[PDB]
Amino acid sequence: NSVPGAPNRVSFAKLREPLEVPGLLDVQTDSFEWLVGSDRWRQAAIDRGEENPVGGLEEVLAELSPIEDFSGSMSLSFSDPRFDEVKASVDECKDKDMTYAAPLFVTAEFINNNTGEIKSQTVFMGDFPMMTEKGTFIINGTERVVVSQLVRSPGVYFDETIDKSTEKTLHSVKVIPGRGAWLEFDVDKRDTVGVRIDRKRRQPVTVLLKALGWTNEQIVERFGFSEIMMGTLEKDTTSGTDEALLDIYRKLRPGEPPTKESAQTLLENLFFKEKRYDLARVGRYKVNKKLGLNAGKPITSSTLTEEDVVATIEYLVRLHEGQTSMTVPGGVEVPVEVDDIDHFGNRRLRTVGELIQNQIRVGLSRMERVVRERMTTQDVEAITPQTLINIRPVVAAIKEFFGTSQLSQFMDQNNPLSGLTHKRRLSALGPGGLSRERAGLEVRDVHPSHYGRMCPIETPEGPNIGLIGSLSVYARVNPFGFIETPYRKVENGVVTDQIDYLTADEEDRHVVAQANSPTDENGRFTEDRVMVRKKGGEVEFVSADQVDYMDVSPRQMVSVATAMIPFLEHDDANRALMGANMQRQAVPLVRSEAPLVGTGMELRAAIDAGDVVVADKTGVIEEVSADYITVMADDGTRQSYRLRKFARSNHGTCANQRPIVDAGQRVEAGQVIADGPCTQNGEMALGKNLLVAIMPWEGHNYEDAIILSNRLVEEDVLTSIHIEEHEIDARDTKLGAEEITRDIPNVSDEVLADLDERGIVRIGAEVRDGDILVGKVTPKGETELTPEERLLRAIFGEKAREVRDTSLKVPHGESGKVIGIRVFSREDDDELPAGVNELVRVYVAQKRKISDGDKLAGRHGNKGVIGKILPVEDMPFLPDGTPVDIILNTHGVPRRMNIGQILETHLGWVAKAGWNIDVAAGVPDWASKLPEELYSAPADSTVATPVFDGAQEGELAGLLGSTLPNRDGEVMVDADGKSTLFDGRSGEPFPYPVTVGYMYILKLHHLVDDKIHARSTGPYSMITQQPLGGKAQFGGQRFGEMECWAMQAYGAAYTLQELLTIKSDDTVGRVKVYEAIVKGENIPEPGIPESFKVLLKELQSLCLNVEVLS
Amino acid sequence: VLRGSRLGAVSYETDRNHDLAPRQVARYRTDNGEEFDVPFADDAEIPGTWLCR
Amino acid sequence: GDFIEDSEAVVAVDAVSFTLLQDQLQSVLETLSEREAGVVRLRFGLTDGQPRTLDEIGQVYGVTRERIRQIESKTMSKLRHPSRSQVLRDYLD
Amino acid sequence: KRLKVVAAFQQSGNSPMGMVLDAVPVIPPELRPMVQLDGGRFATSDLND
Amino acid sequence: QCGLPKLMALELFKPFVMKRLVDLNHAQNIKSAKRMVERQRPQVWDVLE
């Protein structure tokens, strides 16, 4: 394949792929390039047959222009946006906590017509954040991703509902714009047509018709075939066009009687003006396609018109009338049916570019309002464009979007796959969309149009199910925002390698066959009938003559993550979802290793993630070091790549890169020259291959629990580096400026032994919870010590320190090595917040080993907590003495419908120990379908089994039966995949053979270090006197309602009382109970909880006389 | 996550009525005819007018 | 407001601890003769919470302020000797 | 429908003039506190406004 | 029976542990026992058990 550095991973695939997997990050980079109008996008648009393409920002500036003051005495026009070089490098932006942005410049032509003058000069429009290569935004040091938003597209949507009141099928239609007010029509059960403008009270359609100027004759002529409109006209009292305006106007202005001019112009302004109503260039297209109007030209108009509104009304009437095909004067014939709002032919995708463009438009609208207000009150013929253009609102809008918008999310740097799948995520929620607690089931259920566009397997398992998804592997975003997918064209029973990208609504006009349907060597279909999708989403058999399109490859419907799972067929969708989701939670291990049995995706997903380093130009490696790689290109140019070492990710996982090249080695352009965290030789490596035996073992693996060999702890098989950041800032107060110093009041000399002269913890020192990280003190002020303290301080005579200790200390339950310090000082002219003087950040790194309670998981949705780690000698071992690394329970496999893990286990053993099919008298029948490359392979040979073109069930048996002998010359595993294990504790062999193989297991990031809590006594909240928890040290557990029900059901009174009063809210009783425990005395009775007293006070404050009496 | 405090501070002292500050009560009457009492210390210097409840 | 941590909270361990000191100190002062103990108890106001000047202690003891200072010095040196310091040294923190 | 309320006021002896207020109570300050967060920024409940 | 994590058990039983630490003369007083428990000094576990 094109990738030069691919390790030789033999593949079981049998189908030739006609299309190469596209750039997985294109959905972000292409959209952003469109936004800024880069020359690459401009040239590509021309190559697509377009003429005079306009960038996203050029579109906004042209829409803003021309700014015209009323009476037309002057005008202003922005144009020609330009970008200069970025202010700082990405690495420097991250290090110094800046925003990666480039200056933006435009030209502004100001025209004075009353004198004919024209002026123009470059105007600085501010710093514009820039998408870095590999698709992320650096905002205030943090790394952020803008997730594309799936939203229902503007257009006309007809719907029909049957009502049991009369069993009639009532009809309604809604016209939804991208900007402006709404409009809808409906047919009532009384055989009448109604209109609702801006969701106001229902009114007859004839009112709207006569408002536009229609009369009896025109309505009779065009709509006379329908009884409902005739009845509505007969019932309506309106007579004359002005009469309709008389009725309409007072509804919005109850107190002002109408005037003809304003009333007549109100309708045009409300809907038929592009100033206040806009279809946004996509609603226009959809309306033209649906109603058949204005087809065949790129209509610049985006406002509502008279012809289209009446066309929509007529379409509704005909749909109620019962027509199946309709035609329009001056238009084209179209079918008649209701519209499904869940179809991707109706739902579009706001990419990052459009999301940024909307906020740019809002900011420029505010700027326009300010400019048009202030241009009336300045000297004419002496004003200058740069002296009245105010760029503050646009910069403020841009800052707000990247900071507070729900879409601009923190980059998910758990591992390369997590970041890769986060960039191409689709979100149905957020502003302008739906919400988590609404939309019911309909919005989130799967739909036949998702095939090849949105993955049905991968999705959050929590309450966001269906509301969040992943773009398909082959899918690309249409310029209008729709999702396109590629298909092969087939002519009269023979395929043809011309691939067309079809949108969702165009696919329904054809029948598409499966990718795996066999074909002759010439491309002709070999079968008489083929299984195909139909226009309604059904799957049916069809004669080979009738097919007109074909799937590109079997992997078309799955996402990047789902494509990683081998033997995806044998895992139920419920568990496939879990398997796809867990891979995003795997932590990077110290040394990653690629899986023995995997999928062809493992390579590309690693390279496209952007975490690895690839050679930009062909050349020879000149110098290699742990920190940088220098390469001499064949053209005479020299490149230097810096490798980030032990950098802390967003979630605390280490992100170390390492070189994989030797000095003097020649590298082709695009070749991988350094691995990322979870990669080996360019292939992704999220976990570890290890020996698994499937059998219950003394109940330690009971209920999904897992047993590990102690070897994994001795040899750092599952060890991972974790890095934490502790930050402390010194500010000023009314009593003076608090300072950072080594010496602090009343601390033992040993405690401050590892502190620098400036009070910071010495780099490389070992730190344990409670140790000093930064010595800090604050002015104390008035003390007025108690008499006992006065006497004590007289006894020793120690000074009453003018300052109080507020030093930063290691949190409870943390430890590690101090690997770095970053310090900001205002005396050096830093960008510290207002009122801040100093800032110190200390990085503490630790080396976590696998231990009890750590969650492990596989690629097939099987996970569990490590219940016991046994010594090596206690593990069952093969007859040759090799102990099994992990033991999994048998009862969990068959009932969870994830048998694919057993297939993976068998194929892993086949891969570890080479195989050689005995081709002595011809290939065996079961091996007749295998490629010649798979006949033999050495030990430790990696294999690839694509998700829908992998090894069959029959070939696995043969491969198991043809495994090579072990080191000593004997086979450890029989053809059935089982071995005679020996019991490590009693020594006796197990009575029956046990399934043994090699499985790829992942170390999930769900460490309970942030979920283990303990509290005897701690902080209490200011407002409610109950303990706080879940966001600070020593959090308290919530004793819920159902627990109170359980307490009452037990008949347990005293325990419940002490839980609700002493332990939680009785302010007086807490200290009494604490002193009783300390002194060894029995606990006193509880008091009245503060909640009840506050309730009485609150009721009394509301003029309610509430009292307790006996 | 963030912390604050009321406009005052707490005191841990314990003593009770075993210490007595010598006090006496003054009597006041208002315009509407209501009457009120105010305990003052024996240092007295009681004011002639007082803002009652 | 539901998550503001109060800085001036009634810390339990301190609340009891102080009382223990207020007892322990007494046990040390009660180890002296009442003759010595009264001066310290009046000097620092332990008996009634109000510190008293050297002269005012003479209102019940009769001796002059300089002699009260000398008695205070004697008692003050006796208490700070290790035989009694170790009993309550570590309460200062 | 009216008789229910009329009898409710007719019973219990309490007068119906309580529905008109010549004075209103004020909730204690700490149930509507003003607290200065870390850094000196103040936070206050809506009630005291 | 149930198995309780060692450090969680210590943090949960802190005051009970400090009482026994004080009366066993492992610590001079309650404040010293509090600090010693906070440091997880070796003598703590024998009393926690």
Short mmCIF file of all heavy atoms in Angstrom, two decimals, chain A residues 311-353:
data_model
loop_
_atom_site.label_atom_id
_atom_site.label_comp_id
_atom_site.label_asym_id
_atom_site.label_seq_id
_atom_site.Cartn_x
_atom_site.Cartn_y
_atom_site.Cartn_z
N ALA A 311 -47.18 28.04 -3.66
CA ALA A 311 -46.85 26.68 -4.08
C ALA A 311 -46.88 25.71 -2.91
O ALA A 311 -47.37 24.59 -3.05
CB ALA A 311 -45.48 26.66 -4.76
N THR A 312 -46.35 26.12 -1.75
CA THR A 312 -46.40 25.27 -0.57
C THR A 312 -47.84 25.03 -0.13
O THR A 312 -48.21 23.90 0.24
CB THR A 312 -45.59 25.91 0.56
OG1 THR A 312 -44.25 26.13 0.13
CG2 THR A 312 -45.59 25.02 1.80
N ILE A 313 -48.67 26.07 -0.14
CA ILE A 313 -50.07 25.91 0.24
C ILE A 313 -50.77 24.95 -0.71
O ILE A 313 -51.52 24.06 -0.29
CB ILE A 313 -50.78 27.28 0.28
CG1 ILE A 313 -50.11 28.19 1.31
CG2 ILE A 313 -52.25 27.10 0.61
CD1 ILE A 313 -50.52 29.65 1.19
N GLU A 314 -50.53 25.11 -2.02
CA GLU A 314 -51.14 24.22 -3.00
C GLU A 314 -50.65 22.79 -2.81
O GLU A 314 -51.41 21.83 -2.95
CB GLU A 314 -50.84 24.71 -4.41
CG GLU A 314 -51.56 23.93 -5.50
CD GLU A 314 -51.38 24.54 -6.87
OE1 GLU A 314 -50.34 25.19 -7.10
OE2 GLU A 314 -52.28 24.38 -7.72
N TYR A 315 -49.36 22.63 -2.50
CA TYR A 315 -48.82 21.30 -2.25
C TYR A 315 -49.52 20.65 -1.06
O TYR A 315 -49.88 19.46 -1.12
CB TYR A 315 -47.31 21.39 -2.00
CG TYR A 315 -46.57 20.08 -2.07
CD1 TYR A 315 -45.78 19.77 -3.17
CD2 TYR A 315 -46.63 19.16 -1.03
CE1 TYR A 315 -45.09 18.57 -3.24
CE2 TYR A 315 -45.93 17.97 -1.09
CZ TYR A 315 -45.17 17.68 -2.20
OH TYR A 315 -44.48 16.49 -2.26
N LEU A 316 -49.72 21.41 0.01
CA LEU A 316 -50.45 20.88 1.16
C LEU A 316 -51.86 20.46 0.77
O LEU A 316 -52.33 19.38 1.13
CB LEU A 316 -50.49 21.92 2.28
CG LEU A 316 -51.55 21.75 3.37
CD1 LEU A 316 -51.37 20.44 4.11
CD2 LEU A 316 -51.51 22.92 4.34
N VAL A 317 -52.56 21.32 0.02
CA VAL A 317 -53.94 21.01 -0.37
C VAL A 317 -53.99 19.76 -1.23
O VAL A 317 -54.83 18.88 -1.02
CB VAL A 317 -54.57 22.22 -1.08
CG1 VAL A 317 -55.92 21.83 -1.68
CG2 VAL A 317 -54.73 23.38 -0.11
N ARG A 318 -53.09 19.65 -2.21
CA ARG A 318 -53.06 18.46 -3.06
C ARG A 318 -52.75 17.22 -2.24
O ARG A 318 -53.35 16.16 -2.46
CB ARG A 318 -52.03 18.63 -4.18
CG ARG A 318 -52.26 19.80 -5.13
CD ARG A 318 -53.71 19.97 -5.55
NE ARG A 318 -53.87 21.08 -6.48
CZ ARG A 318 -55.04 21.57 -6.87
NH1 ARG A 318 -56.18 21.08 -6.41
NH2 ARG A 318 -55.07 22.58 -7.73
N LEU A 319 -51.81 17.32 -1.30
CA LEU A 319 -51.49 16.18 -0.45
C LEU A 319 -52.71 15.73 0.33
O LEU A 319 -52.98 14.53 0.44
CB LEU A 319 -50.34 16.54 0.49
CG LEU A 319 -49.90 15.47 1.49
CD1 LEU A 319 -49.18 14.34 0.77
CD2 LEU A 319 -49.00 16.08 2.55
N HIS A 320 -53.47 16.68 0.88
CA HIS A 320 -54.74 16.32 1.51
C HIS A 320 -55.73 15.80 0.47
O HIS A 320 -56.47 14.84 0.73
CB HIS A 320 -55.33 17.52 2.25
CG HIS A 320 -56.65 17.25 2.88
ND1 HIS A 320 -56.79 16.81 4.18
CD2 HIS A 320 -57.91 17.35 2.39
CE1 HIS A 320 -58.07 16.65 4.46
NE2 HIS A 320 -58.77 16.97 3.39
N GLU A 321 -55.76 16.42 -0.71
CA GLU A 321 -56.69 15.99 -1.75
C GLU A 321 -56.44 14.55 -2.16
O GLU A 321 -57.38 13.83 -2.50
CB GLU A 321 -56.58 16.93 -2.96
CG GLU A 321 -57.52 16.60 -4.10
CD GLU A 321 -57.14 17.31 -5.39
OE1 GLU A 321 -57.02 18.55 -5.36
OE2 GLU A 321 -56.96 16.63 -6.42
N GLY A 322 -55.19 14.11 -2.14
CA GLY A 322 -54.82 12.76 -2.47
C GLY A 322 -53.94 12.58 -3.69
O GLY A 322 -53.78 11.44 -4.15
N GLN A 323 -53.35 13.65 -4.22
CA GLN A 323 -52.49 13.54 -5.38
C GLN A 323 -51.19 12.83 -5.02
O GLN A 323 -50.65 12.98 -3.92
CB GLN A 323 -52.18 14.92 -5.96
CG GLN A 323 -53.41 15.73 -6.33
CD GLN A 323 -53.15 16.71 -7.46
OE1 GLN A 323 -52.00 16.91 -7.87
NE2 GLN A 323 -54.21 17.34 -7.96
N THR A 324 -50.68 12.04 -5.97
CA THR A 324 -49.40 11.36 -5.82
C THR A 324 -48.28 12.00 -6.62
O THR A 324 -47.11 11.82 -6.26
CB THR A 324 -49.53 9.88 -6.23
OG1 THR A 324 -50.49 9.23 -5.40
CG2 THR A 324 -48.19 9.17 -6.10
N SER A 325 -48.60 12.73 -7.68
CA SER A 325 -47.62 13.49 -8.44
C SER A 325 -48.20 14.86 -8.75
O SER A 325 -49.39 15.00 -9.04
CB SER A 325 -47.24 12.76 -9.74
OG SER A 325 -46.64 11.51 -9.46
N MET A 326 -47.34 15.87 -8.68
CA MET A 326 -47.76 17.26 -8.81
C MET A 326 -46.83 18.00 -9.75
O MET A 326 -45.66 17.64 -9.91
CB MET A 326 -47.77 17.96 -7.44
CG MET A 326 -48.28 19.39 -7.48
SD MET A 326 -48.37 20.15 -5.85
CE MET A 326 -48.88 21.81 -6.28
N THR A 327 -47.37 19.04 -10.39
CA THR A 327 -46.61 19.91 -11.26
C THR A 327 -46.97 21.36 -10.96
O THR A 327 -48.05 21.66 -10.45
CB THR A 327 -46.87 19.61 -12.75
OG1 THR A 327 -45.96 20.36 -13.56
CG2 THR A 327 -48.30 19.94 -13.13
N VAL A 328 -46.04 22.26 -11.27
CA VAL A 328 -46.19 23.68 -10.98
C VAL A 328 -45.98 24.46 -12.27
O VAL A 328 -45.12 24.10 -13.07
CB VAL A 328 -45.20 24.12 -9.89
CG1 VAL A 328 -45.23 25.64 -9.68
CG2 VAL A 328 -45.50 23.41 -8.58
N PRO A 329 -46.74 25.53 -12.52
CA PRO A 329 -46.49 26.34 -13.72
C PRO A 329 -45.09 26.93 -13.69
O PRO A 329 -44.68 27.58 -12.72
CB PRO A 329 -47.57 27.43 -13.65
CG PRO A 329 -48.01 27.45 -12.22
CD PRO A 329 -47.90 26.03 -11.76
N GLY A 330 -44.34 26.70 -14.77
CA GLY A 330 -42.96 27.13 -14.83
C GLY A 330 -41.99 26.27 -14.05
O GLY A 330 -40.83 26.64 -13.91
N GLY A 331 -42.45 25.12 -13.53
CA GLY A 331 -41.60 24.24 -12.75
C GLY A 331 -41.52 22.85 -13.32
O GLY A 331 -41.73 22.65 -14.52
N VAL A 332 -41.21 21.87 -12.48
CA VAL A 332 -41.06 20.48 -12.89
C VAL A 332 -41.93 19.60 -12.00
O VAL A 332 -42.24 19.96 -10.86
CB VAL A 332 -39.59 20.02 -12.83
CG1 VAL A 332 -39.45 18.59 -13.33
CG2 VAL A 332 -38.70 20.95 -13.65
N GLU A 333 -42.34 18.46 -12.54
CA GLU A 333 -43.19 17.54 -11.80
C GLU A 333 -42.42 16.92 -10.63
O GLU A 333 -41.24 16.59 -10.76
CB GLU A 333 -43.71 16.43 -12.72
CG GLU A 333 -44.76 15.53 -12.08
CD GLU A 333 -45.18 14.40 -12.98
OE1 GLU A 333 -44.38 13.99 -13.85
OE2 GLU A 333 -46.32 13.90 -12.83
N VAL A 334 -43.10 16.78 -9.50
CA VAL A 334 -42.49 16.17 -8.31
C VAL A 334 -43.49 15.25 -7.65
O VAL A 334 -44.71 15.44 -7.74
CB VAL A 334 -42.02 17.24 -7.30
CG1 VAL A 334 -40.81 17.99 -7.84
CG2 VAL A 334 -43.15 18.20 -6.96
N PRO A 335 -43.00 14.22 -6.95
CA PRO A 335 -43.90 13.33 -6.22
C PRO A 335 -44.48 14.02 -4.99
O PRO A 335 -43.97 15.02 -4.50
CB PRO A 335 -43.00 12.16 -5.83
CG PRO A 335 -41.63 12.73 -5.79
CD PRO A 335 -41.59 13.80 -6.83
N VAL A 336 -45.58 13.45 -4.49
CA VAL A 336 -46.32 14.00 -3.36
C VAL A 336 -46.26 12.99 -2.22
O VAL A 336 -46.75 11.86 -2.36
CB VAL A 336 -47.77 14.34 -3.72
CG1 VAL A 336 -48.54 14.77 -2.49
CG2 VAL A 336 -47.82 15.42 -4.79
N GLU A 337 -45.66 13.39 -1.10
CA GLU A 337 -45.63 12.56 0.10
C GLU A 337 -45.17 13.43 1.27
O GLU A 337 -44.67 14.54 1.08
CB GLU A 337 -44.71 11.34 -0.08
CG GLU A 337 -43.21 11.65 -0.12
CD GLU A 337 -42.72 11.98 -1.52
OE1 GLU A 337 -43.56 12.27 -2.40
OE2 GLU A 337 -41.49 11.96 -1.73
N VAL A 338 -45.35 12.90 2.48
CA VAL A 338 -44.88 13.61 3.67
C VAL A 338 -43.37 13.46 3.80
O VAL A 338 -42.74 12.61 3.16
CB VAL A 338 -45.60 13.11 4.93
CG1 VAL A 338 -47.08 13.50 4.89
CG2 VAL A 338 -45.44 11.59 5.08
N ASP A 339 -42.78 14.30 4.64
CA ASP A 339 -41.34 14.37 4.81
C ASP A 339 -40.94 13.77 6.15
O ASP A 339 -41.55 14.10 7.18
CB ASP A 339 -40.85 15.82 4.71
CG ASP A 339 -41.09 16.42 3.34
OD1 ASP A 339 -40.52 15.89 2.36
OD2 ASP A 339 -41.84 17.41 3.24
N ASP A 340 -39.94 12.90 6.14
CA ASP A 340 -39.39 12.31 7.36
C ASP A 340 -38.25 13.20 7.85
O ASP A 340 -37.22 13.33 7.19
CB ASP A 340 -38.92 10.89 7.11
CG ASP A 340 -38.66 10.12 8.39
OD1 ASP A 340 -38.58 10.76 9.46
OD2 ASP A 340 -38.52 8.88 8.32
N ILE A 341 -38.44 13.81 9.03
CA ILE A 341 -37.45 14.75 9.55
C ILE A 341 -36.18 14.08 10.04
O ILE A 341 -35.17 14.77 10.24
CB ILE A 341 -38.05 15.60 10.69
CG1 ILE A 341 -38.78 14.72 11.70
CG2 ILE A 341 -39.00 16.65 10.12
CD1 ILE A 341 -38.92 15.35 13.07
N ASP A 342 -36.20 12.77 10.25
CA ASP A 342 -35.01 12.05 10.71
C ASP A 342 -34.10 11.62 9.57
O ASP A 342 -33.00 11.12 9.83
CB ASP A 342 -35.43 10.81 11.51
CG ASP A 342 -36.26 11.16 12.73
OD1 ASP A 342 -35.94 12.16 13.40
OD2 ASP A 342 -37.24 10.43 13.00
N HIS A 343 -34.53 11.79 8.32
CA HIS A 343 -33.73 11.37 7.18
C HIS A 343 -32.55 12.32 6.99
O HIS A 343 -32.70 13.54 7.11
CB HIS A 343 -34.61 11.35 5.93
CG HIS A 343 -34.14 10.40 4.87
ND1 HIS A 343 -32.99 10.58 4.14
CD2 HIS A 343 -34.70 9.25 4.40
CE1 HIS A 343 -32.85 9.59 3.28
NE2 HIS A 343 -33.87 8.77 3.42
N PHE A 344 -31.37 11.77 6.69
CA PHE A 344 -30.21 12.62 6.43
C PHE A 344 -30.35 13.44 5.15
O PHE A 344 -29.54 14.33 4.93
CB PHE A 344 -28.92 11.79 6.35
CG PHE A 344 -28.38 11.35 7.69
CD1 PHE A 344 -27.38 10.40 7.75
CD2 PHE A 344 -28.84 11.91 8.87
CE1 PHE A 344 -26.86 10.00 8.97
CE2 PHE A 344 -28.33 11.52 10.09
CZ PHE A 344 -27.34 10.56 10.14
N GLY A 345 -31.35 13.16 4.32
CA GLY A 345 -31.68 14.10 3.27
C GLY A 345 -32.30 15.38 3.77
O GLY A 345 -32.51 16.31 2.99
N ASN A 346 -32.59 15.44 5.07
CA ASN A 346 -33.16 16.62 5.71
C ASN A 346 -32.30 17.19 6.83
O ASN A 346 -32.42 18.38 7.13
CB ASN A 346 -34.55 16.30 6.27
CG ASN A 346 -35.52 15.83 5.20
OD1 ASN A 346 -35.42 16.22 4.04
ND2 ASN A 346 -36.45 14.97 5.58
N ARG A 347 -31.45 16.38 7.46
CA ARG A 347 -30.57 16.84 8.54
C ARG A 347 -29.18 17.09 7.98
O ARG A 347 -28.59 16.21 7.35
CB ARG A 347 -30.51 15.82 9.67
CG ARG A 347 -31.83 15.58 10.38
CD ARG A 347 -31.73 14.45 11.38
NE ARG A 347 -31.08 14.87 12.62
CZ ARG A 347 -30.75 14.05 13.61
NH1 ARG A 347 -30.99 12.75 13.54
NH2 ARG A 347 -30.17 14.55 14.70
N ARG A 348 -28.66 18.29 8.22
CA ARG A 348 -27.35 18.69 7.74
C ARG A 348 -26.37 18.78 8.91
O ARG A 348 -26.74 18.60 10.08
CB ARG A 348 -27.43 20.04 7.01
CG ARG A 348 -27.82 21.21 7.89
CD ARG A 348 -28.08 22.45 7.07
NE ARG A 348 -26.86 22.96 6.45
CZ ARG A 348 -26.05 23.85 7.01
NH1 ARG A 348 -26.27 24.34 8.21
NH2 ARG A 348 -24.97 24.24 6.33
N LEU A 349 -25.11 19.06 8.58
CA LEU A 349 -24.02 19.04 9.54
C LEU A 349 -23.30 20.39 9.51
O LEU A 349 -22.60 20.70 8.53
CB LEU A 349 -23.05 17.90 9.24
CG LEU A 349 -22.12 17.49 10.38
CD1 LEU A 349 -22.88 16.74 11.45
CD2 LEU A 349 -20.96 16.65 9.85
N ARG A 350 -23.46 21.17 10.57
CA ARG A 350 -22.65 22.37 10.77
C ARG A 350 -21.23 21.95 11.14
O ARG A 350 -21.01 21.40 12.22
CB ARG A 350 -23.25 23.24 11.87
CG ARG A 350 -24.59 23.86 11.55
CD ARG A 350 -25.21 24.44 12.81
NE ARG A 350 -26.26 25.41 12.53
CZ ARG A 350 -26.94 26.08 13.46
NH1 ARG A 350 -26.69 25.90 14.75
NH2 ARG A 350 -27.88 26.93 13.09
N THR A 351 -20.29 22.19 10.24
CA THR A 351 -18.89 21.92 10.52
C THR A 351 -18.30 23.06 11.35
O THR A 351 -18.97 24.03 11.69
CB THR A 351 -18.12 21.73 9.22
OG1 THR A 351 -18.30 22.87 8.37
CG2 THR A 351 -18.60 20.48 8.49
N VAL A 352 -17.01 22.94 11.67
CA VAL A 352 -16.35 23.97 12.48
C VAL A 352 -16.40 25.32 11.77
O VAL A 352 -16.61 26.36 12.39
CB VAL A 352 -14.89 23.56 12.78
CG1 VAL A 352 -14.11 23.29 11.49
CG2 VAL A 352 -14.21 24.62 13.64
N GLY A 353 -16.21 25.31 10.45
CA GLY A 353 -16.18 26.56 9.71
C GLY A 353 -17.47 27.35 9.86
O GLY A 353 -17.45 28.55 10.14
#
